[PDB]
Design a protein around this nucleic acid. Structure first.
Ligand SMILES: Nc1nc2c(ncn2[C@@H]2O[C@H](COP(=O)(O)OP(=O)(O)NP(=O)(O)O)[C@@H](O)[C@H]2O)c(=O)[nH]1
Ligand SMILES: [Mg+2]
Ligand SMILES: [Mg+2]
Ligand SMILES: [Mg+2]
Ligand SMILES: [Mg+2]
Ligand SMILES: [Mg+2]
Ligand SMILES: [Mg+2]
Ligand SMILES: [Mg+2]
Ligand SMILES: [Mg+2]
Ligand SMILES: [Mg+2]
Ligand SMILES: [Mg+2]
Ligand SMILES: [Mg+2]
Ligand SMILES: [Mg+2]
Ligand SMILES: [Mg+2]
Ligand SMILES: [Mg+2]
Ligand SMILES: [Mg+2]
Ligand SMILES: [Mg+2]
Ligand SMILES: [Mg+2]
Ligand SMILES: [Mg+2]
Ligand SMILES: [Mg+2]
Ligand SMILES: [Mg+2]
Ligand SMILES: [Mg+2]
Ligand SMILES: [Mg+2]
Ligand SMILES: [Zn+2]
Lengths: 129, 104, 88, 14
RNA sequence: GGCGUAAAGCGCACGCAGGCGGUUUGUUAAGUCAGAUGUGAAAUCCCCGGGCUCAACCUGGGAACUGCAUCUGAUACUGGCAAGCUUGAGUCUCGUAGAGGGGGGUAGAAUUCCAGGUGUAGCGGUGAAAUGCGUAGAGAUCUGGAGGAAUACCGGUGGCGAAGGCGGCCCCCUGGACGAAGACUGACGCUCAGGUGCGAAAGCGUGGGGAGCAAACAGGAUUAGAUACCCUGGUAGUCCACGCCGUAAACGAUGUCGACUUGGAGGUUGUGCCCUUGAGGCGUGGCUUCCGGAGCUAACGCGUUAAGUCGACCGCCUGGGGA
RNA sequence: UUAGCUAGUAGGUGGGGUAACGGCUCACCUAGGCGACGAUCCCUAGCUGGUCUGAGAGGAUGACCAGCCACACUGGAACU
């Protein structure tokens, strides 16, 4: 079903980015806000808005270069069938340090570049390539 | 039920108590007539040697041709009609075996 | 399943009001009376394996609904199992 | 292909 | 790493255990993460050296040994507890469509049998013949009666059912699917090893039934032989009850569920609004076929019903033959 | 193509026993115990630090060195 809504979130981003869609909407949650707000601060997307309180609806503004996909590919890493965890020195890089890896720790959701100054490890969410 | 079975193989050699050898044969139901012309079919029967050159024409199919002296010998009774009707069955078999092609 | 007089009565029997029709205890009673309605049917019609699929669906549906009240509040669970004649 | 399938029985080495 | 056609998705369904799980808050700190302690014998390997004239070799210290245990921390995610919430999954009403299944009647053609009437030399069959049938009158036609099984047209990539499958009409019992308006419970869910049930036809057991068709078999042609083809007959079987057997090219050769991603030609089934100004106009759900963009694929092709991009779970394959 | 195994077996009492706890042993009492997270049965095998292979993850193996266990013709027993 919708057992991995983060994988459902990454499905809706990769489709609309490739099919030249201007903006998408999706059901919101606390975890989907904490990931899209990081992608807004890392130049991958443009803006996010929330709509509705009894039915929380998250919106994302897409981003293009000259009509080209900014987010070329994104890869869900951990999953409910197999959980993935790393330490503070085993955090993997994406495209040898070009792409970022979204890792949620006890100090909130940050990147692997931001986790070096934080010195923590935890759950890998997605490889933002 | 009403047929025969070929159990023994191709040929096994032995000797007579007097002299000579024996050669067994398979159960064979085959007829290979791809060898030569139908002129040699006329030579394949003994009593039909003495009746050649007696018909009307110098070439004769001996089935639908008028004045066949070989057919007159069958109608007289010196040649049995079982051999004559089987003779043109050989010729009509060559109209059915030859169809696709075969050559050595 | 049943008629309108048989449906609306049992909702008023086990529900708090006329609007109490979506709760789990009402849904058990809709399946309990229906299986009790089909006792004499499948005895005479043992070659009807297609209606038996609808029967075994409601048996599996009622078993899943009894497991929800049992894991949450056993006080209402022990009331309904003897009020309808369950647990065999 | 499923990891949870290989929990019951691993890949059979010939 | 694969499972439409190269080897591979169980014939299908239910469902326990197992795995997995919407959303909001609090708590626990289990999992995970941070730090510290103890420990992980030496040797081997690695780093910098030293030494044997060199190298192999020996050897100093460090690193490593990604391990385990305990303590102190952090709480985003996962787990547990607690309170919920409603879009998931369900419930009620009003409805609509349908060969969904089971049971009990009934209809009229057609086939064969039988009775009667009129009527005469062939009927029948094939490429051509023959077996067979008929002057006890066949065949053909008409009247009357019996029995058996199947339902022309409608009828269509049409509908329904989990699948195999399901078709005269009518009644009785009963199953699901879908649409509209709201009300209501509050994750009640997905999935499935064993287990459980259904499951084309043939065949088997018991007892009935018997038209037509038809293994074995009878007869006639065909033929080198005819065993098959073709023709005239014909038992088992096909029919029903009661069991058993559980295999198919049981195929969409695609396991189930959910989420999104340009679209047309249609079909079927509803619903909402509209000079009702026509069975129309405009939308909008359920089911289904043919094309086709991006994309994917070995090609063929698939392409909003995916074989596109993903997640949840399960089955199965590892050269051909042996098998 | 191993699914049920087990009566000193599982637990308790008391006595006895060993350097030490203990069905270790005995009488009695209870009917449990183990097990689809592989009990039990069959076959094979000393194990580990390691070595070798491999980019790594893995794979194969346990000679020489070192640690431990077991064995000393076969089987059984106790003394010191
Ligand atoms: N009554 C009878 N039976 C005979 C006679 N000759 C042979 N038979 C039988 O006929 C059968 C056939 O004999 P066989 O010689 O085997 O035939 P074949 O031609 O050799 N057969 P194949 O083609 O296999 O070689 C045998 O059973 C034999 O006993 C005879 O004169 N009288
Ligand atoms: Mg109904
Ligand atoms: Mg391959
Ligand atoms: Mg194949
Ligand atoms: Mg199938
Ligand atoms: Mg050491
Ligand atoms: Mg050292
Ligand atoms: Mg060293
Ligand atoms: Mg030197
Ligand atoms: Mg939680
Ligand atoms: Mg009739
Ligand atoms: Mg409420
Ligand atoms: Mg029999
Ligand atoms: Mg025949
Ligand atoms: Mg029978
Ligand atoms: Mg099969
Ligand atoms: Mg096809
Ligand atoms: Mg194209
Ligand atoms: Mg297409
Ligand atoms: Mg093989
Ligand atoms: Mg004691
Ligand atoms: Mg040994
Ligand atoms: Mg030693
Ligand atoms: Zn002549």
């Amino acid at each position: 079903s919708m057992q991995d809504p983060i994988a459902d979130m990454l499905t809706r981003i990769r489709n609309g980015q490739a099919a030249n869609k201007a903006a998408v909407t999706m059901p919101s949650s606390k975890l989907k806000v904490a990931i899209a707000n990081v992608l807004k601060e890392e130049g991958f997307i443009e803006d996010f808005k929330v709509e509705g309180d009894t039915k929380p609806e998250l919106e994302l503004t897409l981003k293009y270069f000259q009509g080209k996909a900014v987010v070329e590919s994104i890869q869900r890493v951990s999953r409910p069938g197999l959980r993935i965890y790393k330490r503070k020195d085993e955090l993997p890089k994406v495209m040898a340090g070009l792409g970022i890896a979204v890792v949620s720790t006890s100090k909130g959701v940050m990147t692997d570049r931001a986790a070096r100054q934080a010195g923590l490890g935890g759950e890998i969410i997605c490889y933002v390539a | 039920s009403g047929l025969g079975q070929h159990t023994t193989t191709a040929a096994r050699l032995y000797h007579f108590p007097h002299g000579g050898d024996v050669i067994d044969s398979p159960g064979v139901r085959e007829f290979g007539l791809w060898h030569l012309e139908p002129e040699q079919i006329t030579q394949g029967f003994v009593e039909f040697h003495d009746y050649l050159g007696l018909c009307k024409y110098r070439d004769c199919k001996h089935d639908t041709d008028p004045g066949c002296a070989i057919r007159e010998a069958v109608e007289e009774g010196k040649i049995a009609e079982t051999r004559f009707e089987n003779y043109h069955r050989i010729l009509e078999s060559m109209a059915q075996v030859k169809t696709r092609k075969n050559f050595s | 399943s049943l008629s309108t007089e048989a449906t609306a009565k049992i909702v008023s029997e086990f529900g708090r009001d006329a609007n109490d029709t979506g709760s789990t205890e009402v849904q058990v009673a809709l399946l309990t009376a229906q299986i009790n309605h089909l006792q004499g049917h499948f005895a005479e019609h043992k070659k009807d394996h297609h209606s038996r699929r609808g029967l075994l669906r409601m048996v599996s549906q009622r078993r899943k609904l009894l497991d929800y009240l049992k894991r949450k509040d056993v006080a209402r669970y022990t009331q309904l199992i003897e009020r309808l004649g369950l647990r065999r | 292909a499923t990891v949870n399938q290989l929990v019951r029985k691993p890949r059979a080495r010939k």
